[PDB]
Design an enzyme around this catalytic site. Structure first.
Site, PDB file in Angstrom:
ATOM      1  N   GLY A 109       4.001  10.966  -0.462  1.00  0.00           N
ATOM      2  CA  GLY A 109       2.905  11.544   0.294  1.00  0.00           C
ATOM      3  C   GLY A 109       2.331  10.603   1.335  1.00  0.00           C
ATOM      4  O   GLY A 109       2.161   9.405   1.081  1.00  0.00           O
ATOM      5  N   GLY A 139      -3.961  10.310   6.275  1.00  0.00           N
ATOM      6  CA  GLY A 139      -4.614   9.634   7.382  1.00  0.00           C
ATOM      7  C   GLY A 139      -5.115   8.245   7.053  1.00  0.00           C
ATOM      8  O   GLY A 139      -5.265   7.419   7.962  1.00  0.00           O
ATOM      9  N   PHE A 140      -5.376   7.964   5.780  1.00  0.00           N
ATOM     10  CA  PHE A 140      -5.918   6.676   5.369  1.00  0.00           C
ATOM     11  C   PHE A 140      -4.976   5.869   4.485  1.00  0.00           C
ATOM     12  O   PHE A 140      -5.299   4.724   4.147  1.00  0.00           O
ATOM     13  CB  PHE A 140      -7.254   6.868   4.642  1.00  0.00           C
ATOM     14  CG  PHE A 140      -8.370   7.324   5.536  1.00  0.00           C
ATOM     15  CD1 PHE A 140      -8.523   8.665   5.846  1.00  0.00           C
ATOM     16  CD2 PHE A 140      -9.265   6.411   6.066  1.00  0.00           C
ATOM     17  CE1 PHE A 140      -9.550   9.086   6.668  1.00  0.00           C
ATOM     18  CE2 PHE A 140     -10.293   6.826   6.888  1.00  0.00           C
ATOM     19  CZ  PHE A 140     -10.436   8.165   7.190  1.00  0.00           C
ATOM     20  N   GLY A 141      -3.833   6.421   4.102  1.00  0.00           N
ATOM     21  CA  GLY A 141      -2.904   5.676   3.278  1.00  0.00           C
ATOM     22  C   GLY A 141      -1.729   6.530   2.863  1.00  0.00           C
ATOM     23  O   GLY A 141      -1.481   7.595   3.433  1.00  0.00           O
ATOM     24  N   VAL A 164       0.928   7.716  -0.723  1.00  0.00           N
ATOM     25  CA  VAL A 164       1.052   7.894  -2.163  1.00  0.00           C
ATOM     26  C   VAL A 164       2.486   7.577  -2.551  1.00  0.00           C
ATOM     27  O   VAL A 164       3.429   8.134  -1.977  1.00  0.00           O
ATOM     28  CB  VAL A 164       0.663   9.316  -2.605  1.00  0.00           C
ATOM     29  CG1 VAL A 164       0.954   9.504  -4.085  1.00  0.00           C
ATOM     30  CG2 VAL A 164      -0.804   9.569  -2.328  1.00  0.00           C
ATOM     31  N   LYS A 168      -1.894   6.409  -5.149  1.00  0.00           N
ATOM     32  CA  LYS A 168      -2.510   6.680  -3.855  1.00  0.00           C
ATOM     33  C   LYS A 168      -3.108   5.380  -3.333  1.00  0.00           C
ATOM     34  O   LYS A 168      -4.119   4.896  -3.854  1.00  0.00           O
ATOM     35  CB  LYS A 168      -3.570   7.771  -3.969  1.00  0.00           C
ATOM     36  CG  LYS A 168      -4.344   8.005  -2.680  1.00  0.00           C
ATOM     37  CD  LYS A 168      -5.381   9.106  -2.828  1.00  0.00           C
ATOM     38  CE  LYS A 168      -4.733  10.479  -2.865  1.00  0.00           C
ATOM     39  NZ  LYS A 168      -5.757  11.560  -2.907  1.00  0.00           N
ATOM     40  N   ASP A 207     -12.622  21.959  -0.180  1.00  0.00           N
ATOM     41  CA  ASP A 207     -11.482  21.624   0.667  1.00  0.00           C
ATOM     42  C   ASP A 207     -10.209  22.343   0.223  1.00  0.00           C
ATOM     43  O   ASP A 207      -9.104  21.821   0.378  1.00  0.00           O
ATOM     44  CB  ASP A 207     -11.268  20.110   0.692  1.00  0.00           C
ATOM     45  CG  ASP A 207     -10.503  19.643   1.919  1.00  0.00           C
ATOM     46  OD1 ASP A 207     -10.383  20.421   2.889  1.00  0.00           O
ATOM     47  OD2 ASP A 207     -10.032  18.486   1.914  1.00  0.00           O
TER      48      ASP A 207
HETATM   49  O1  LIG Z   1      -5.512   9.975   3.393  1.00  0.00           O
HETATM   50  C1  LIG Z   1      -5.302  10.922   2.712  1.00  0.00           C
HETATM   51  N1  LIG Z   1      -6.315  11.953   2.564  1.00  0.00           N
HETATM   52  C2  LIG Z   1      -7.581  11.812   3.258  1.00  0.00           C
HETATM   53  C3  LIG Z   1      -8.490  10.838   2.519  1.00  0.00           C
HETATM   54  C4  LIG Z   1      -8.255  10.544   1.258  1.00  0.00           C
HETATM   55  C5  LIG Z   1      -9.150   9.589   0.538  1.00  0.00           C
HETATM   56  C6  LIG Z   1     -10.142   9.062   1.151  1.00  0.00           C
HETATM   57  C7  LIG Z   1     -10.412   9.404   2.609  1.00  0.00           C
HETATM   58  N2  LIG Z   1      -9.643  10.225   3.228  1.00  0.00           N
HETATM   59  C8  LIG Z   1      -3.955  11.057   2.000  1.00  0.00           C
HETATM   60  C9  LIG Z   1      -3.320  12.437   1.837  1.00  0.00           C
HETATM   61  C10 LIG Z   1      -2.153  12.555   1.235  1.00  0.00           C
HETATM   62  C11 LIG Z   1      -1.520  13.941   1.068  1.00  0.00           C
HETATM   63  C12 LIG Z   1      -1.355  14.548   2.480  1.00  0.00           C
HETATM   64  C13 LIG Z   1      -1.387  16.130   2.534  1.00  0.00           C
HETATM   65  N3  LIG Z   1      -2.531  16.573   1.766  1.00  0.00           N
HETATM   66  C14 LIG Z   1      -2.307  16.226   0.414  1.00  0.00           C
HETATM   67  C15 LIG Z   1      -2.408  14.763   0.140  1.00  0.00           C
HETATM   68  C16 LIG Z   1      -1.988  14.537  -1.338  1.00  0.00           C
HETATM   69  O2  LIG Z   1      -1.030  13.515  -1.392  1.00  0.00           O
HETATM   70  C17 LIG Z   1      -0.413  13.355  -2.639  1.00  0.00           C
HETATM   71  C18 LIG Z   1       0.972  13.616  -2.776  1.00  0.00           C
HETATM   72  C19 LIG Z   1       1.589  13.451  -4.015  1.00  0.00           C
HETATM   73  C20 LIG Z   1       0.842  13.034  -5.079  1.00  0.00           C
HETATM   74  N4  LIG Z   1       1.105  12.750  -6.508  1.00  0.00           N
HETATM   75  N5  LIG Z   1      -0.014  12.358  -7.159  1.00  0.00           N
HETATM   76  C21 LIG Z   1      -0.877  12.390  -6.251  1.00  0.00           C
HETATM   77  C22 LIG Z   1      -0.568  12.762  -4.956  1.00  0.00           C
HETATM   78  C23 LIG Z   1      -1.177  12.925  -3.735  1.00  0.00           C
HETATM   79  C24 LIG Z   1      -1.437  11.314   0.710  1.00  0.00           C
HETATM   80  C25 LIG Z   1      -1.985  10.124   0.858  1.00  0.00           C
HETATM   81  C26 LIG Z   1      -3.337   9.987   1.553  1.00  0.00           C
HETATM   82  F1  LIG Z   1      -3.907   8.754   1.707  1.00  0.00           F
END
Ligand SMILES: O=C(NCc1ccccn1)c1cc([C@@H]2CCNC[C@H]2COc2ccc3[nH]ncc3c2)ccc1F
Lengths: 339, 59, 621
Positions: C168, C171-173, C175, C190, C287
């Site tokens: 995954g 925008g901020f990192g 997974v 994550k 969300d």
């Molecule tokens: O910055 C990300 N969000 C915004 C954010 C997040 C936290 C704090 C501030 N701002 C972000 C998003 C994502 C994905 C992208 C598409 N929307 C789903 C998000 C879920 O991703 C996963 C994928 C597989 C997984 N298995 N267990 C857990 C898990 C999670 C991935 C990493 C992120 F870093």
């Protein structure tokens, strides 16, 4: 008022007691002994150094065999030493860390100790298989045990911070006799040669003579300006000496019922922790908070010698019954045998 | 204290201490010196004994 | 691997827990590892509590029976074995209301999953106290102290995980799929870059995601991505989460196209149970959209990314938060208070997108934000939709909050009773027994997809100093299902060889007034890195150590203070002695250092105040 008249009457008795004593002060011990020769220089060297305790030593007591020696220490242990060979006969771990005093029974079959646990514990030294187990815990005092002395194997006398003394039946654990009268923590006691009387010194700056078998206070001695930390009988049972925080030792005669001599020097400012007489009573040995033991001429009140071999407070001392040596315990965890 | 019984106990105690037979200090002082004289020979710390009778002198 | 401490840890551990009231039956029995050890104690090491726990376990197995034909057979067996035959021997220590409740239902042939529930209360009342104190006196509570010492000494670094392929990107990192080395449990990591957080000013979301993950990660919800650990490096923030390596629905909605009503019914059912679990813990998600719905290896789904979810247990939110096309009318309207009703409206928008390929308000292929807003503020359902589905979306997409389905005062239960779900057994939904409509193929290849020249400061790191966290229920479950039995056996044979060797060679703490005893490392000559590991004994007036009886000590009157400092990036104890000397000590775990610091301080304060009032022991001028 009756309470006022009893206070008024108690003051007149104090004056009557004072004037009766002054009626006996025809001469002084210093004048009486002004003719005898001085003892000279008492030069004693260290013969043994007992190494074993891991913290401050608080009290020691010689056995009647003039060889075995028990001591109580901040490390919560009693050690029974062979002063001839420095070998430890028994190292007794105590149930309470706050041990403050210890005694060796005349028969050598039992030792006693106690402290802030308010209990005198009798330890048996005759068990073959088991090595030195508690035979009795004497509970009854409401303050710390400051000193204890066996009369025989079945009776022991204790002094306490609850301002009282007590006589115990060891077989039943009963506090058979209570000795009330002091108004401060009783710090030390000393049995008479015939074990029929005993003296006690308390934080009320007074010493008291007690009848063991009758439980009464016979005589009260004043003079010290601070607490009396140590006390011991003259070898013939007619006098006793007291060591005090006021940096002085004093001799009190029983039959004349007053102080005879004051052992002090302007150089000496620290308090006395222990006192003992030589076998003949000529020498008065006293332990001091300035790490020294001073040997006093008991008849002329001169400084006869100084035992200097400890790096901390000399907390206890004692002369063997044969008069062959003196042991000194210290806050530096060491005992030393001198002659 | 305001205890009447305690005050009686003290007055009775001081009478026991007052009504005793006292000797002169001169006699008390002489008896003590006479004891030291009689036993000054039996005192190893006073008159020093040789190294033979001493258990702590190289034995 | 995992290394249990020696059983001598009990002395320090038992005082650590007892200062926190953690030696309650209610506190140890309700823990996964505490139950296993307390149960192992009652079964094998006690003939009296053995029937009590076997009765307890047969009830817990009865509660998990799915159908009525199994519970009629099991309830009679339990009653005939733990009720009747115990009453026949008069050794049945339970009240009359307990026997009348079970026997009343059985002759009536009523077998609800909570039939034996009144016995659960009384079985605990008989285990608590008498049996619980005999348990503390046993080696099983010692083993509990050994395991609890491990749990309380957890400090995770990146090297504690084997990191694998990316599953995954955000925008901020990213997974990653990872494996925790000591137990082998597969997780997701994550990993958020603190740098990219400062540039985009999202420090609030990062910290909010942790506290939101912390509120939901207890109870093991199958439909939310829950957190087991959280830790940070100087550069990254790491959440350790349920492994979901099947991609999000946003990606699968593109590869597969729109879903049929039946295929949508699956995802709808599992999301509702996830929203129910979140609403039961007073959390509104806000969300909900296909991108935040992840798939596992088999096709089951979970709600993820709790950054925008906020707690509404105290003050309800009112800010415009969410994704345009899914936000409720009262969400977009700023200053208008709202609660969990946003997720039910978000569900309607998301379920329509799975059916028709777009949000109901993103019409004629618009990218304009302000247009999707006004088409929502103040409902064309096509001729293709069935009447039951039409009723569900019309209920979920009501603009008035007082008329929207799931907002009428019963929560998710109302949505479960919608005729669109009339065919589903919701217990079968919870047990994940319905076949998923989409089974992802192995290999991510961009299935969960959504530089910089700024530096980090000391002020930026202080916001992340309360970030480390470990969910105790998660760690114990992770341990219990992997190495708990294997480690217990490995460390049992070592404690047996210790007694097999010490009995031929040759305790210093018994029979006295010893407060505490255990291992500690004191510093000798620091230029030689000379650390000496010794067993210490703390008495009311001294501290002894040995390696051979104790040959030195330290009195409580020598100690002037006890201050905690750091030596070579490790927490140590610094004792200042009266003689201008310093004493340095090191422990093996954080709780040991916390306890020694507390007890050593307690001992030198009480002892010095005690010595002061004793003329023979006190210091004089
Ligand atoms: O910055 C990300 N969000 C915004 C954010 C997040 C936290 C704090 C501030 N701002 C972000 C998003 C994502 C994905 C992208 C598409 N929307 C789903 C998000 C879920 O991703 C996963 C994928 C597989 C997984 N298995 N267990 C857990 C898990 C999670 C991935 C990493 C992120 F870093």
């Amino acid at each position: 008022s009756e309470l006022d008249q009893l206070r008024q009457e108690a003051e007149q008795l104090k004056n009557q007691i004072r004037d009766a004593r002054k009626a006996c002060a025809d001469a002084t011990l210093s004048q009486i002994t002004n003719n005898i020769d001085p003892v000279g220089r008492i030069q004693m060297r260290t013969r043994r150094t007992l190494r074993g305790h891991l913290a401050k030593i608080y009290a020691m007591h010689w056995g009647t065999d003039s060889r075995l020696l028990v001591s109580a220490s901040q490390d919560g242990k009693l050690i029974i030493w062979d002063s001839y060979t420095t070998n430890k006969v028994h190292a007794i771990p105590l149930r309470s860390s706050w041990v403050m005093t210890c005694a060796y029974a005349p028969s050598g079959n039992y030792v006693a100790c106690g402290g802030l646990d308010n209990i005198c514990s009798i330890y048996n030294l005759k068990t073959r298989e088991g090595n030195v187990r508690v035979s009795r815990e004497l509970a009854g005092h409401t303050g710390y045990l400051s000193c204890c002395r066996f009369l025989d194997d079945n009776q022991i006398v204790t002094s306490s911070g609850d301002t009282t003394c007590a006589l115990w039946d060891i077989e039943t654990g009963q506090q058979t006799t209570t000795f009330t009268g002091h108004t401060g923590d009783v710090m030390s006691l000393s049995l008479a040669p015939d074990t029929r009387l005993f003296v006690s010194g308390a934080c009320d700056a007074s010493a008291k003579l007690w009848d063991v078998r009758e439980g009464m206070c016979r005589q009260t001695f004043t003079g010290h300006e601070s607490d009396i930390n140590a006390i011991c009988f003259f070898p013939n049972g007619n006098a006793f000496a007291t060591g005090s925080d006021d940096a002085t030792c004093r001799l009190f005669d029983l039959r004349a019922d007053q102080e005879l001599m004051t052992y002090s020097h302007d150089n000496i400012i620290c308090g006395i922790t222990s006192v003992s007489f030589s076998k003949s009573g000529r020498l008065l040995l006293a332990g001091y908070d300035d790490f020294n033991c001073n040997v006093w001429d008991a008849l002329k009140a001169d400084r006869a010698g100084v035992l200097a071999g400890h790096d901390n407070r000399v907390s206890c001392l004692g002369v063997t019954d044969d008069g062959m040596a003196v042991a000194t315990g210290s806050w530096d965890s060491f005992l030393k045998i001198w002659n | 204290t305001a205890s009447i019984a305690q005050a009686r106990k003290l007055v009775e105690q001081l009478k026991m201490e007052a009504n005793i037979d006292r000797i002169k200090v001169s006699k008390a002082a002489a008896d003590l010196m006479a004891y030291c004289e009689a036993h000054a020979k039996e005192d190893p710390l006073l008159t020093p004994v040789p190294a033979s009778e001493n258990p702590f002198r190289e034995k | 691997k995992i290394l249990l401490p020696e059983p001598s840890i009990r002395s320090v551990m038992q005082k650590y827990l007892e200062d926190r009231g953690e030696v309650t039956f209610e506190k140890i029995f309700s823990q996964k590892l505490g139950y296993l050890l307390f149960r192992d104690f009652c079964l094998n090491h006690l003939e009296e509590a053995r029937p009590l726990v076997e009765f307890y376990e047969e009830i817990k197995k009865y509660e998990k029976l799915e159908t009525e034909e199994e519970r009629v057979a099991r309830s009679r067996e339990i009653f005939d074995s733990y009720i009747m035959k115990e009453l026949l021997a008069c050794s049945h220590p339970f009240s009359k209301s307990a026997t009348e409740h079970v026997q009343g239902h059985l002759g009536k042939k009523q077998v609800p999953p909570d039939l034996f529930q009144p016995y659960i209360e009384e079985i605990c009342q008989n285990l608590r106290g008498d049996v619980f104190q005999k348990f503390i006196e046993s080696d099983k509570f010692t083993r509990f102290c050994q395991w609890k010492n491990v749990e309380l000494n957890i400090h995770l670094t990146m090297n504690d995980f084997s990191v694998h392929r990316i599953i995954g990107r955000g925008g901020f990192g990213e997974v990653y799929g990872c494996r925790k080395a000591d137990t082998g449990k597969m997780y997701a990591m994550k990993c958020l870059d603190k740098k990219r957080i400062k540039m985009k000013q999202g420090e609030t979301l990062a910290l909010n995601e942790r506290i939101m993950l912390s509120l939901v990660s207890t109870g093991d919800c199958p439909f939310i991505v829950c957190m087991s650990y959280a830790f940070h490096t100087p550069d990254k923030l790491s959440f350790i989460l349920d492994l979901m390596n099947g991609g999000d629905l946003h990606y699968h909605l593109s590869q597969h196209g729109v879903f049929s009503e039946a295929d949508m019914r699956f995802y709808a059912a599992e999301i509702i149970l996830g929203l129910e679990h979140m609403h039961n813990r007073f959390v509104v998600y806000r969300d909900l959209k296909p991108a935040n719905i992840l798939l596992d290896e088999h096709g089951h789904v979970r709600i993820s990314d709790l950054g925008l979810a906020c707690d509404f247990s105290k003050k309800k939110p009112h800010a415009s938060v969410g994704t345009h096309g899914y936000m409720a009318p009262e969400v977009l309207q700023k200053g208008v208070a709202y609660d969990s009703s946003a997720d039910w409206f978000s569900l309607g928008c998301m379920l329509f997108k799975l059916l028709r390929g777009h949000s109901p308000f993103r019409q004629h292929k618009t990218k304009d934000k302000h247009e999707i807003d006004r088409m929502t503020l103040t409902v064309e359902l096509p001729d293709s939709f069935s009447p039951e589905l039409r009723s569900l979306l019309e209920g979920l997409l009501q603009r008035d909050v007082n008329r929207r389905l799931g907002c009428l005062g019963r929560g998710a239960q109302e949505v479960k009773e919608s005729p669109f779900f009339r065919s589903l057994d919701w217990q079968m939904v919870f047990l994940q027994k319905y076949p998923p409509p989409l089974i992802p193929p192995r290999g991510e290849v961009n299935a969960a997809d959504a530089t910089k020249g700024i530096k980090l400061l000391d002020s930026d790191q202080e916001l992340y100093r309360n970030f480390p966290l470990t969910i105790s229920e998660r760690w114990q479950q992770e341990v219990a299902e992997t190495v708990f039995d294997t480690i217990n056996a490995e460390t049992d044979r070592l404690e047996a060889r210790k007694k097999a060797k010490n009995k031929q060679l040759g305790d210093y703490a018994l029979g006295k007034d010893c407060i505490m005893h255990g291992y500690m490392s004191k510093m000798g000559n620091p230029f030689l890195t000379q650390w000496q590991r010794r067993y210490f004994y703390l008495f009311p007036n001294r501290l002894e150590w040995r390696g051979e009886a104790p040959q030195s000590l330290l009195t409580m009157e020598e100690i002037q203070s006890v201050e905690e400092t750091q030596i070579k990036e490790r927490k140590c104890l610094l004792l200042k002695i009266r003689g201008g000397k310093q004493f340095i000590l090191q422990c093996d775990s954080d709780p040991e250092l916390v306890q020694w610091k507390k007890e050593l301080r307690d001992a030198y304060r009480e002892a010095q105040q005690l010595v002061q009032r004793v003329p023979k022991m006190k210091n004089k001028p």
